Design a binder for this molecule. Structure first.
Ligand SMILES: Cc1cc(N2CCCC2)nc(/C=C/c2ccc3ccccc3n2)n1
Ligand SMILES: [Mg+2]
Ligand SMILES: [Zn+2]
Length: 313
């Protein structure tokens, strides 16, 4: 009960900031997550024994892929932790419980391939899940782990509170399908501007949580430039591998996934920042003003990619 997780001074201070990098020591990442759970939710939210056994099962079920790996899971959870901590009173107890878990589990058993490649490969999962293929799989893996003996971290919740939290996690993980982001932010943009956005309306809370999940999932672009730049290498390592696999199916991949077209990457990043990243953090900042530092960092990184195109680096 009285066993608190404590980090070294530099981590204790920087973990509160949006642009925190969780560092290269894999064996510290579980403690970093438990720390965030305790501060964000409370020490009483989860039985420490069950939480630690849940975390280590989740870790085992992420693969050794360049980007969609255990470090991404913890990185996304940290961005969520910084959003919740900066928006103390806006979220219920169930939401703070569910959302940190959702982020940790949002990419469980990712193979480094997109929904499009699964579809064109004719992968079994594309037969079982027609849309949001990988994200339905990620939620399925999450339920599977929660049902392992000694792994049900939500055991102390009532039947209705257990169903509510598992529904928050399901919608939260499905929201990380980027195909669904574009419509979700447009609807939120309309609701904000026409003034009809209501945080007591559950349908509106769902959309706002969806956008939060996109914000955390893309948070590679909200880091200090050296982290953003080095993470981009891991991102493109997965894209170029999928491109190779598209060429093996006899399909020319989109330039984003063609390793022959690396020269085009800097302009590709501008498109992504202007079409996905900047819009996402702008709407988030409109709804949740204290998340402004994600937008600012994102704009700083947009400017660094412009400098790359201009040959200044
Ligand atoms: C049309 C186009 C072209 C392109 N190029 C790369 C080289 C050739 C053309 N890159 C993108 C965006 C990539 C992307 C996607 C998700 C991302 C998610 C997080 C961070 C960066 C991301 N970047 N889009
Ligand atoms: Mg995903
Ligand atoms: Zn992700």
């Amino acid at each position: 009960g009285l066993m608190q997780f404590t980090l070294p001074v530099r981590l204790c201070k920087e973990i509160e900031l949006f642009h925190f990098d969780i560092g290269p020591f894999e064996n510290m990442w579980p403690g970093i997550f438990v720390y965030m759970v305790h501060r964000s939710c409370g020490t009483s939210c989860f039985e420490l024994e069950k939480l630690c056994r849940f975390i280590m099962s989740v870790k085992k079920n992420y693969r050794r892929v360049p980007y969609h790996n255990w470090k991404h899971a913890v990185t996304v959870a940290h961005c969520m932790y910084a959003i919740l901590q900066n928006n103390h009173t806006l979220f219920t107890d169930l939401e703070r419980k569910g959302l940190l878990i959702a982020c940790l589990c949002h990419d469980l058993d990712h193979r480094g391939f997109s929904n499009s490649y699964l579809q064109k490969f004719d992968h079994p999962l594309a037969a079982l899940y027609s849309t949001s293929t990988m994200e339905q799989h990620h939620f399925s893996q999450t339920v599977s782990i929660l049902q392992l003996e000694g792994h049900n971290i939500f055991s102390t919740l009532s039947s209705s509170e257990y169903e509510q939290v598992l529904e928050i996690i399901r919608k939260a993980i499905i929201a990380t399908d980027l195909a669904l982001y574009f419509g979700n932010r447009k609807q939120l943009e309309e609701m904000y501007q026409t003034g009809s956005l209501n945080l007591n309306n559950q349908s509106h809370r769902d959309r706002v949580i969806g956008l939060m999940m996109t914000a955390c999932d893309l948070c590679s672009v909200t880091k200090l430039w050296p982290v953003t730049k080095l993470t981009a290498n891991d991102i493109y390592a997965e894209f170029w591998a999928e491109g190779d696999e598209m060429k093996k199916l006899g399909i020319q991949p989109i330039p984003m996934m063609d390793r022959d077209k690396k020269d085009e990457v800097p302009q590709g990043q501008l498109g992504f920042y202007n079409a996905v990243a900047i819009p996402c953090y702008t709407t988030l900042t409109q709804i949740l003003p204290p998340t402004e530092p994600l937008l600012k960092a994102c704009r700083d990184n947009l400017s660094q990619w412009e400098k790359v195109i201009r040959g200044e680096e």
